[PDB]
Amino acid sequence: MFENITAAPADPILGLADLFRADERPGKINLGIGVYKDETGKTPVLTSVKKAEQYLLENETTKNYLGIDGIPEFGRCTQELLFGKGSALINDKRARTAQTPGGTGALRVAADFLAKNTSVKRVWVSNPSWPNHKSVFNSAGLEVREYAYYDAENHTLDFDALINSLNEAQAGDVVLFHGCCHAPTGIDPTLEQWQTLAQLSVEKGWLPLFDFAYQGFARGLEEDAEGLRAFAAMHKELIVASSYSKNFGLYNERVGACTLVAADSETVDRAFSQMKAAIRANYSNPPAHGASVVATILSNDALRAIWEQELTDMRQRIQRMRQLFVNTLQEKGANRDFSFIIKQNGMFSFSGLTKEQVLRLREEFGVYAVASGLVNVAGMTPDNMAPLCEAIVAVL
């Protein structure tokens, strides 16, 4: 069967990474990275997870299969993180969490459950969005449509265009929202905008699916959950796909969760059984190690205190690199109003550079960025900031 199979393309970041390692120049900077890096250009394993891992090694007596939905405590812990510690959704037991292989894994079991157990045909995604979204929904045969979001020339959330695009969505469509640190723009709705979106959502009958991969990177753990909780307060049903890859630095251990909320415990158990059938037909039951680390940190006060502090250190490093970028550019002098960088949250932002400007940034300076001018702020350090900003001033 494989003699005229056509080749699949290479995803942008992969391609850039190759071109970067093959770049003989020494002062090269890779801003198209997709992962967090600290002030020394490394993605370390957190001290809290090394300690949780030491512990698991001394206490694990079996590697026997976890249940389809993973470890119960992991479920407890992401529900409290997501919905707040004394939430009505938790006390009325309207929610069920399945441990998945990362946030992508969570999005695919949601897509498979939806495609086979309900009537969704369409999923609405922001323009732009995190790239892999369309492939995940399309593999499940659920059609993807885009709503407007980003105002290119103004570097802002075009809320009017947003609510006006979404009026073409009809009752029974899924609308996907990024919970905080919108990938790739870094522009998030304000809390009032989240509440008018929540109200509009119930009124037109949308099924909200939240992709929550950056909790803790915009303001803090509870602050970042504000919009999701504005929705959960008004919706009988919702799905939230969360990831622990970035806030726990556990990228390759594949730890995420898919949480189903329904009107009552009875209907969420019935729906959840079909979500478990979907997992059973995909990877059977989930990888214990990364989720086990997350569950022992979150349930222990000492370990969780260390983790929270390590996460604010990440958040604050990103926040001073956004500051430093604007300042060193303004100091190196050109016609900047890169001020919008300061108002965006998370590791990503569109710089406003044109694709031929990023092309001579690679060719002439060795600064590597995605052709759309997307830049990962975590690739900037105090040491590479002045070479970076000089290169940007030279191509402007």
Residue 267, CA atoms < 13 Å, CB-side half-sphere = 7
Note whether 30 binds ligand PLP by CB under 6 A.
no
Note whether 250 binds a second copy by CB under 8 A.
yes
8 binds, among ligand PLP, a second copy, none (CB under 5 to 8 A by kind): a second copy
How do beta strands 256-261 and 238-243 pair? antiparallel
Annotated active-site residue 307? The verdict is no
Ranges assigned E (strand) in the chain: 29-30, 95-100, 122-127, 143-148, 150-151, 156-157, 174-178, 207-212, 238-243, 256-261, 348-350, 367-368, 374-376
CA 78 centroid distance within chain = 15
Q: What is the DSSP letter of 217?
A: S
Annotated active-site residue 204? The verdict is no
Give the one residue of 30, 48, 104, 247 binding ligand PLP; rule: CB under 6 A: 104
Note whether 102 binds ligand PLP by CB under 6 A.
yes
Counts of helices then strands in the chain (DSSP H, E): 14, 13
211 binds, among a second copy, ligand PLP, none (CB under 5 to 8 A by kind): ligand PLP
**What part of residues 103-142 is at the interface with a second copy (CB under 8 A)?**
104-105, 108, 112, 114, 116-120, 132, 135-136, 138-139
**What part of residues 360-379 is at the interface with a second copy (CB under 8 A)?**
none
Give the Cα separation of 88 and 311 in Å (integer).
Answer: 27
Closer residue to ligand PLP (CB): 97 or 243: 243
**What part of residues 326-355 is at the interface with a second copy (CB under 8 A)?**
none
- Choose the stretch contacting ligand PLP; rule: CB under 6 A; options: 20-28, 101-109, 272-280, 297-305: 101-109
Give the Cα separation of 325 and 389 in Å (integer).
Answer: 7
Helices 288-299 and 301-332 pack at an angle, to 10 degrees, of 100
Note whether 308 binds a second copy by CB under 8 A.
no
Closer residue to ligand PLP (CB): 60 or 337: 60
Give the one residue of 185, 201, 215, 243 binding ligand PLP; rule: CB under 6 A: 243
Q: Which amino acid is at 175?
A: V
Note whether 253 binds ligand PLP by CB under 6 A.
no
Give the one residue of 40, 61, 91, 154 binding a second copy; rule: CB under 8 A: 61
